[PDB]
Subunit: 113 residues, 3 copies
Amino acid sequence: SSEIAALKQEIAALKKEIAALKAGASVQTAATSWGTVPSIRVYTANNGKITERCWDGKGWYTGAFNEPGDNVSVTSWLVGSAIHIRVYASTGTTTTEWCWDGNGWTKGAYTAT
Amino acid sequence: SSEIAALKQEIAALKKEIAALKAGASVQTAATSWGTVPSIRVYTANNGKITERCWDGKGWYTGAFNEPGDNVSVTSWLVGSAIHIRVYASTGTTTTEWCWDGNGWTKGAYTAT
Amino acid sequence: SSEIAALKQEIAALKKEIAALKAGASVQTAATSWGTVPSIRVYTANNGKITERCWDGKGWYTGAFNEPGDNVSVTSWLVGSAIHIRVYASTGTTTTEWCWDGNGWTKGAYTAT
Ligand SMILES: OC[C@H]1O[C@@H](O)[C@@H](O)[C@@H](O)[C@@H]1O
Ligand SMILES: OC[C@H]1O[C@@H](O)[C@@H](O)[C@@H](O)[C@@H]1O
Ligand SMILES: OC[C@H]1O[C@@H](O)[C@@H](O)[C@@H](O)[C@@H]1O
Ligand SMILES: OC[C@H]1O[C@@H](O)[C@@H](O)[C@@H](O)[C@@H]1O
Ligand SMILES: OC[C@H]1O[C@@H](O)[C@@H](O)[C@@H](O)[C@@H]1O
Ligand SMILES: OC[C@H]1O[C@@H](O)[C@@H](O)[C@@H](O)[C@@H]1O
């Protein structure tokens, strides 16, 4: 019947659309750096978790940052030689700020409101 | 019939794929900062609109920036004490540059070409 | 029959969900800047390719950077007057670092591990 043949091309069209959406998919990164060496921190949202990779001039290694998020952005600044980093990790519509200030990642005051 | 049973598992498979796509979805953020206080600006693309949240050392508040976009990136620089911000808001394939230079957001010269 | 009418509303619901996913889609940008002029570089992931647009104070032009990627982030730093840029281009779960250090884009040591 042409009733079943119609829906068989309907699902075929939906497979073309879903495959186009899946084509664009990838991990999401954010990067910051400081000084002249330099130091570089690269944050990667992958499968709902954000991890950190670090460079201080002598090879790449995994940093202490490990939090949930499907999206990430980062900024940092120097107070003298001391580095301060702010990572904004988002899941759904909730965005949590994470703060490095010398020894450990803490939850920041940021809200979207 | 096994004709109807085939399409009933076809749509069931498409529900698994669409749910996987929706799982990764979230708001998209960009951040910049300047000075030593510091000042921080956080831009959030949510539901086709980009809004701005601000920190100058004494709590978070909503900034003047409000434009359309599903994606956002930002950079900024200091000319002395004066801050200049450039926000690149994208919808589809169109990317508009927005310029802060001391009093108001203006449309920048940027084009993708 | 109500067997065919059921699947005709099933596919209708999947069209609403796919259209919501396609609504959020856009090009993805990252930006960096340096100095006081300033110089600005804007990277755009579009249809699996990342291109670069440049500003050094006298109009926008297309830069040498051209690599594959569905996601992009960037950071840069000055060693004196010399600019160094690091672009992290991601496809699927693979993230390649690209390095500008004065004459040409080279593949960087970065790995996600
Ligand atoms: O030296 C490694 C450490 O560097 C700091 O700047 C932060 O990025 C930490 O998360 C990281 O573990
Ligand atoms: O020290 C913690 C505080 O640091 C500031 O720079 C901001 O990032 C605040 O949102 C944060 O709570
Ligand atoms: O002080 C608030 C103002 O700060 C400026 O740097 C910009 O971010 C404006 O959009 C904002 O309204
Ligand atoms: O002052 C306006 C101009 O400022 C420059 O720094 C660039 O961002 C231009 O694209 C913009 O049009
Ligand atoms: O002046 C143009 C050149 O500027 C450099 O800083 C890099 O961004 C190159 O990719 C670009 O071609
Ligand atoms: O000069 C090449 C090297 O430069 C460093 O700053 C890092 O970005 C390395 O990952 C890269 O391989």
